[PDB]
């Protein structure tokens, strides 16, 4: 009755894992490798296509992770290796015009450094932050001396994130989930096809996710398994919270030649008084923001429970503190003032919350050991303004008879930051060949 | 006029009108990563074309064959298949028989070629 008919160009697909390439419109995020983007993207709405997405099993995240680390490392290949600096340092405290918080935070160090000629030496006096220097009682060494060589970041290369678009190869397509209130790990009734993602800025931070996308209707709580306290919870806000960060001290930067065409940059002195670095959020915005987060948490933790926020429990400074790059400087801000509250169902000025911050010049990124970067000091005074777009929270374990849940800031695993931008994308392979019965018979001779 | 995969979700009998829309988008260090992606796209394209060649469908997007449809692959009538299903749904329904159908298509073409060769030798 019916015969097999072969069709080619059939609109079907399968989940697939392939290699994606970058595209974009000096900087660490070099655009030297990336394909210039198209004048405009296209988006095809797919009516009546319901598809299943899983943000926690998404290989786009792993590729972004590998590419970001690769670009990071490539940018340091031509930079000065500061191995002549791993010497005994003679250090005393900076006591000149220091405020109450800046006590022992800066040390004035002196050492015998190499110079252009091998038979010559020079005496160098520089200021260091305490966190970068470890005592050996005036004898100190840099903290990286017993684990790694340190490379000076090149002074002319910016650390400002540049949006990167990921693009699929021919034969593949990226499906985008357009649903609002999509938490990942589900069917998505409204989808469309794109060839490239929106530009994603590789902003690096812990605890608070800066400069990402916002939810349009409600705060969205996302997790791999919400009842597993070992998992992180990502929270996407529907409004930005503005945060104002500064490094108030006016620095004078000096440099010396330490070899044949190589130079080291260091803080020479501080022009004015010495103050602590800090970040501000308004109280009203932060307090409204948490109320919104709490209402949504109650969906998973219902029956009028008590929701408490608390400080990070411990670990390396990177995880317990809010890490970010502000104008090229590396800040570690204390968020204990943001996560100190108890919420119940019975509830309810330029006043603001000031978060004290510490600064480091020796940076060990991506949780790797054996590599380190020295961040040159920046002359002048630093100020940056960012938008808080989401949070990383963890939940305390405990008995099941508890009426209280406690949430704390988390982070340190960069892949979870990426996941907050890539959650709506899936890569599929196009499978254009297929068969179906028809009444058409091939002519026989 | 719909774009690429625009007909996904439409019925099979509607989607079949856009075969050239999808066909034209096929085939359209760190340099190594990019080359591997390009080489792979070519290899996949060529393998599909090779099957169409083997089955005698080399120049066509729609190709009729001499393999009877088995009710055991899908005991479903034409109205249901062409009007009430999408290609994604169909693909799931018969994914288990893909290699049976392909094997049959190859065998049929081999027999056809031998018959043509002999008819042309009749003199």
């Amino acid at each position: 009755n019916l015969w097999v008919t072969v069709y080619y160009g059939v609109p079907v697909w399968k989940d697939a894992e392939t290699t994606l390439f970058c595209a974009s419109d000096h900087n660490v995020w070099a655009t030297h490798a990336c394909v210039p983007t198209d004048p405009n993207p296209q988006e095809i709405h797919l009516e009546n296509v319901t598809e299943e997405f899983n943000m926690w099993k998404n290989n786009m995240v792993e590729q972004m992770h590998e590419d970001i680390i690769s670009l990071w490392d490539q940018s340091l290949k031509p930079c000065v290796k500061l191995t002549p600096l791993c010497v005994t340092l003679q250090c005393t405290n900076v006591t000149n015009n220091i405020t109450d918080d800046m006590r022992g935070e800066l040390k004035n160090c002196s050492f015998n450094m190499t110079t252009e000629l091998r038979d010559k030496k020079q005496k160098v006096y520089s200021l260091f932050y305490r966190l970068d220097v470890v005592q050996i009682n005036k004898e100190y060494r840099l903290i990286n001396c017993n684990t790694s060589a340190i490379t000076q970041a090149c002074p002319k290369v910016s650390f400002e994130p540049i949006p990167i678009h990921y693009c699929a190869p021919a034969g593949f397509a990226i499906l985008k989930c357009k649903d609002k209130k999509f938490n990942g790990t589900g069917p998505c009734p409204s989808v469309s096809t794109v060839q490239c993602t929106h530009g994603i800025k590789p902003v690096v931070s812990t605890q608070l996710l800066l400069n990402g996308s916002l939810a349009e209707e409600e705060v969205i709580i996302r997790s791999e398994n919400i009842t597993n306290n070992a998992k992180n919870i990502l929270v996407q806000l529907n409004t930005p919270v503005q945060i104002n960060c500064t490094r108030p001290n006016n620095n004078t930067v000096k440099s010396i030649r330490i070899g044949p065409g190589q130079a080291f940059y260091y803080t020479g002195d501080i022009i004015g008084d010495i103050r602590q670095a800090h970040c501000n959020v308004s109280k009203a915005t932060w307090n409204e923001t948490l109320g919104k987060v709490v209402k949504q948490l109650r969906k998973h933790f219902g029956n009028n429970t008590i929701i408490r926020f608390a400080q990070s429990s411990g670990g390396d400074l990177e995880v317990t503190t809010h890490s970010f790059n502000c104008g090229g400087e590396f800040f570690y801000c204390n968020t204990s003032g943001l996560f100190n509250s108890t919420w119940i169902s019975n509830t309810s000025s330029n006043d603001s919350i000031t978060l004290p911050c510490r600064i480091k010049q020796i940076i060990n990124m991506w949780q790797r050991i054996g590599q380190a970067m020295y961040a040159p000091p920046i002359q002048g005074v630093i100020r940056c303004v960012s938008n808080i777009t989401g949070l990383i929270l963890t939940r305390d374990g405990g008995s099941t008879n508890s009426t209280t849940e406690t949430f704390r800031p988390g982070g340190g695993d960069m892949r979870d930051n990426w996941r907050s931008e890539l959650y709506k994308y899936k890569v599929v392979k196009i499978e254009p060949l297929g068969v179906a019965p028809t009444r058409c018979k091939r002519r026989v001779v | 006029s719909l774009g690429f995969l625009g007909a996904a979700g439409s019925t099979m009998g509607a989607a079949s009108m856009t075969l050239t829309v999808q066909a034209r988008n096929l085939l359209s260090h760190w340099g190594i990563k990019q080359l591997q992606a390009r080489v792979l796209a070519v290899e996949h394209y060529l393998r599909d074309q090779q099957l169409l060649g083997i089955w005698g469908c080399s120049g066509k997007l729609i190709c009729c064959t001499n393999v009877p449809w088995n009710s055991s692959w899908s005991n479903r009538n034409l109205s249901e298949i062409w009007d009430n299903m999408t290609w994604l749904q169909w693909d799931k329904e018969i994914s288990n028989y893909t290699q049976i159908i392909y094997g049959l298509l190859e065998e049929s073409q081999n027999q056809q070629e031998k018959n043509e060769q002999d008819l042309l030798a009749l003199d």
Partner: antibody
Framework: VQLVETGGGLVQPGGSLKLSCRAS????????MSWVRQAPGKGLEWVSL????????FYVDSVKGRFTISRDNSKNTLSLQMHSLRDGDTAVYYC??????????????????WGQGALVTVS | ALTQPPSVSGSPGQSVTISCTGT?????????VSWYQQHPGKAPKLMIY???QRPSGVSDRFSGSKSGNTASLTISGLQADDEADYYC???????????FGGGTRLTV
């Protein structure tokens, strides 16, 4: 469902007449259509067939050199242009639905919905 | 044309068989032999299609069958209104599409 015929009446031999059929109550474009004629003292004779799209036409040998069948789906209209009319072409012509279907449709080798016809006289 | 006997008749309440005869290429080769009826002054109505199928609106007193190169329509329970002319029609192939038979004028 209705099929309504309008068109020419009496012509002298060697002349030309055109018939038109309009129809409604169904999707016009889903069906193939045909003209059948009945001489005043005779039974039924098939004259022509057109597919649903309008690209394929078939004729009875007797009219191959003189009749054209065409359709325009946007106006739900079927038509027949007759040239070089003979006395032997006097008949009531009827439009009807069916006689063919596409490869993705169930077989439909019969006519089902008929119009009431129009009389064509050649004298 | 297909052969179809003229003037086949019977009394009300009886059954009648109206046969149709073709050749091996017309009836013997294809199971597409429809039947139509026509009241004077009206366009024909489809009564049977394929061989044994009946369209909605047609009662079950009308049924067909075939054997060899012939086919038939039987009407059981003849009614007062069953006095239409009947015709058989079959699909003959690609070169010749349809062949109609002669008519039968049924009376009761």
């Amino acid at each position: 469902v209705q099929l309504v015929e309008t068109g020419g009446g009496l012509v002298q031999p060697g002349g030309s007449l055109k018939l038109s059929c309009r129809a409604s109550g169904y999707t016009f474009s889903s069906f193939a259509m045909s003209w059948v004629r009945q001489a005043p003292g005779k039974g039924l004779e098939w004259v022509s067939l057109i597919n649903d799209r309008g690209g394929l036409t078939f004729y009875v040998d007797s009219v191959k050199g003189r009749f054209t069948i065409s359709r325009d789906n946007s106006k739900n209209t079927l038509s027949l242009q007759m040239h070089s009319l003979r006395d032997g072409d006097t008949a009531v012509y009827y439009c009807a639905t069916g006689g063919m279907s596409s490869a993705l449709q169930s077989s439909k080798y019969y006519f089902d919905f008929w119009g009431q016809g129009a009389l064509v006289t050649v004298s | 044309a297909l052969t179809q006997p003229p003037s086949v008749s019977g009394s009300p309440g009886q059954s009648v068989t109206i046969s149709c005869t073709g050749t091996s290429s017309d009836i013997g080769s294809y199971n597409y032999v429809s039947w139509y009826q026509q009241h004077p002054g009206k366009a024909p109505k489809l009564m049977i299609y394929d061989v044994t199928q009946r369209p909605s609106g047609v009662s079950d007193r009308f049924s067909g069958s075939k054997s060899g190169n012939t086919a038939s329509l039987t009407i059981s329970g003849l009614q007062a209104d069953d006095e239409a002319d009947y015709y058989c029609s079959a699909y003959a192939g690609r070169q010749t599409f349809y062949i109609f038979g002669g008519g039968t004028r049924l009376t009761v």
